[PDB]
Amino acid sequence: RKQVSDGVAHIHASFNNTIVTITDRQGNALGWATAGGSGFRGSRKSTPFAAQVAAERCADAVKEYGIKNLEVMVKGPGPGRESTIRALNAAGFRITNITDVTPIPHNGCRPPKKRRV
Amino acid sequence: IKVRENEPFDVALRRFKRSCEKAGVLAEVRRREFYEKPTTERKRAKASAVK
Amino acid sequence: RRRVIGQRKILPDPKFGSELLAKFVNILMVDGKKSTAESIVYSALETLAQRSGKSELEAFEVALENVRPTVEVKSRRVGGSTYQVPVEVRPVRRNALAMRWIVEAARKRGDKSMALRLANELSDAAENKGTAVKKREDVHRMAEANKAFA
RNA sequence: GCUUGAGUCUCGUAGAGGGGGGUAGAAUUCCAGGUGUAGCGGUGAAAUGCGUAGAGAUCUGGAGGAAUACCGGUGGCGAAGGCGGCCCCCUGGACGAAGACUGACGCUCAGGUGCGAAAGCGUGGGGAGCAAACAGGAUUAGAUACCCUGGUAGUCCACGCCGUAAACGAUGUCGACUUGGAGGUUGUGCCCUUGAGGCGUGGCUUCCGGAGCUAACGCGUUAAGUCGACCGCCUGGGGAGUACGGCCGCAAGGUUAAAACUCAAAUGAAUUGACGGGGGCCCGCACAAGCGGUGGAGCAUGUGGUUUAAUUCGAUGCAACG
RNA sequence: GCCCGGAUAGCUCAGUCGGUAGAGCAGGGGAUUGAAAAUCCCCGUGUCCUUGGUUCGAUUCCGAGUCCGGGCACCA
Secondary structure, three states, X not given: OOOOOEOOEEEEEOOOOEEEEOOXXXXXXXXXXXXXXXXXXXXXXXXXXXXXXXXXXXXXXOOOOOOOEOOEEEEOOOOOOOHHHHHHHHHOOOOOOEEEOOOOOOOOOOOOOOOOO | XXXXXXXXXXXXXXXXXOOOOHHHHOHHXXXXXXXXXXXXXXXXXXXXXXX | OOOOOOOOOOOOOOOOOOHHHHHXXXXXXXXXXXXXXXXHHHHHHHOHHHHOOOOOOHHHHHHHHOOOOOOEOOOOOOOOOOOOOOEOOOHHHXXXXXXXXXXXXXXXXXXXXXXXXXXXXXXXXHOOOHHHHHHHHHHHOOOOOOOOOO
C-alpha cells in the first residue's frame, strides 16, 4: 500500500537455482520470486523457461503497489539472465535500464579447487 | 555494461556487452584456479593458433 | 533407419469411403479378420441412431476431439542421464493415436460385447469418460505440464 | 712490445632482476543495523548443512587477510630457483653507439664458498580464501577415495634450519667456422625522415627447414653439423640409490655408497595390427516409429539338473537346446 | 560357591498381554553375463537350550538344570 511507482529488480542468476526480487528504488524488498518455490524443485528448475515462471510470480506479490516502471539487475551467470527480463517485459512492467552486476573481481580471493571426477 | 533505449522494445543490445566479460571470465573462475596448468595450456593452445 | 519414402495409402471405409475411418477399422482389426472389424465397428458406428437420432457421421470426429492430444514426452539419452523433452504431435498421428486409445481402452470396458462395448465409448469420448479421455490429461500432465525440459 | 680477447671510462636504452617502505581498487568472509519472507545451499540426483531465534536476496556502515582482472604476448628480466597493481628509497646485470683508456690482465675449474620450487622444521606473530588430518552426507558389492557440507596444521610475515623436484631444453661452460625463409622484442645509423612508414647494422628470442649429423624420432648458425679447451658423468636388469660406515640435520631425513643372491634379459625409437568407457565419416529391423509376440497359463519339445541297473553318445555365448 | 543376564533359522540377531515368529547375511531356483561376481526376480525344512509345573493350550508364565556371559569370593 506504499505505491513505489518504480523500483529496480535484482536477478540473482545462479546455476543450481535463480531468484528475482522486485526491490524498490533505495533497495528495499517489495517482492521476491524463486524457482525452488515455483512448484518444480529438485533440479528441474535452473532452465530459463523455469525461472520465467518464477520471477513472474512477483507480479502476484509485488502487484499490491503499482510498479509502472522498473530497471533490471542481472547478477551471476546461469539459465535466468535473459528469461527473467523477458517474462518481466510481458508481465506488463516497463523498463529503464538493463545491467549486469555479476561479481567480477581482479584475481582477489582464490576460488575452490573442487570438482575432479 | 549499461543498457538504455527509447521506444519500448525488447530488441537486445545486451549481447554487445557480451564480448568483454560475461559468462567466460565467470566460468573462468567457477571451479579452482590454475597455477602451472595455465602457463602451460596457455602456451600450448597458442601453438594451435598457427594453422 | 535412413529410409525415407511415403505413407501407406489405405483403402477407405467399406461405405463412407474415408481414409480417416479406413486405418480406423485396421487399428481396430484383429487376426486379419478384417471382416469382423467392419461388422463390429460399422455397426456401433451407426447404432448411434438409438443413442441419438440423426445423420450420425460427424459424431465420430466430434467424439475424437475429446481424445485428440497435442503434446507427448520423449526420453533422450543425453546429459548423462535420460531427458524427457516433451514435444507436440503432428496431425498424421494425432488422429491415429486417439483411435488407439478409443479402441485399446474400449476393450477393457467389460460391457455386453465388443460391438457395443465400443459404441458406448464413443458417446463417452465426446462426453469425456473412460481411460480413453483419461489418457489425454494423464499424458498432458507430462508435456506442457513439465516444460522445464521442453 | 702490439690490439682483435678480456676489462675501465662516457652517454643512452628496455626490463615482473633483487632488498626495504609505502599506497590503491575490485572481490571473499565476518560483525552490526534497515528492507523483506519461506526458502537457501548443493548434486547426476540427493543428503549432511543453513532457514520462522527470520536465512538466502537486498542495502548502509565497519573489521581483516590474501592476491593484484584488463594491459599480457608465440612478451620481458634473472646463473639457476624464480620474478606481475601504482609510488618512493637502496642496489645488480644485459645491450647499443661515436668514441677515449688498460694491454692477454683470459677459458675452464676437483676440493671449497654461496644461492635453492614446493612440502617440512623451530621461536614468535598472523589467519579472509583455500585446504593434508579429521567429521558428517552420498556413491558402491565394498569406498578408510573420486562428489557434497564442514575443517586443523599449512598456505601469509619475521628470523633461523632443511637442501630435494619430471630443479627439464631430460641437451655443462667458453670460443671459431658452416645454405636459407617467415616472425617477435629491444638499441643505433641512414632515407623527399614528407608516412603507417623504407634501407641497413648489433643484442636477446619463436617457428619452418638445407647440407650434415642421428638407431629412429628428430637437431639443424640459439645444432644433436665441423672443430678446439676444461670439467661432471655412464659401463646389463632386479636386488638398490637400499644396507653398513663416515659426514651433515632439531627431526623428517639428505650426501657418499656395496654385497649376497637372482634373471637373459632390462631398454630406446620406429612398423604391422588388436583394443580404448579417443576423435572424424559411415552402413545393418542396431536403435528410434509402429504390428504382433516371448516372460505368467495348460500342453508339445529339447536341455541342465535330480534320479535311474540304464536313463546310449554327441551338440554348450552370439555359432548350444523342435 | 555366590548374585545378574543370554540360550529363537546354518551364522549374528530382533521379537510375543499365552493359541499359527521374523530381519541382515549365508543357502537355494530363475534371470542378466562370453563366464564369474555386483545386481534383478521367487523362495524358511525353526520340534524358539533341557526338565519339571500352571493351563483346555507354553518359545512365551512358575521351579529347577546345563551351558555361556558380566560381577564377586573380601579381614585372615
